[PDB]
Amino acid sequence: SMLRPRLCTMKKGPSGYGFNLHSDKSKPGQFIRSVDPDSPAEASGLRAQDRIVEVNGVCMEGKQHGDVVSAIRAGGDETKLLVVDRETETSL
Secondary structure (H helix, E strand, O other), X not given: OOOOOEXXXXXXXXXXXXXXXXXXXXXXXXXXXXXXXXOHHHHHXXXXXXXXXXXXXXXXXXXXXXHHHHHHHHOOOEEEEEEEOOOOOXXX
16 A cells, blocks of 8 residues: 555546546545556556545545546546545544
């Protein structure tokens, strides 16, 4: 598990970025379902099960699937995803 969030910077190719984003039925946030081989997303270091915490420097906390997709699309042909790979908050 990473010690700090990772910034994954990518430019679209002919097939887009090359990842699938999805909601989880049991926990909040938007997660990378898959990363295509030989894609911009793969080259950026993005991995399956990463959770998006920022898009282009904007906090995605509380944002639903469509709002995160919109934020990604709004950046045009490039995106910068700040991601984590584990839970970062717990109520006790």
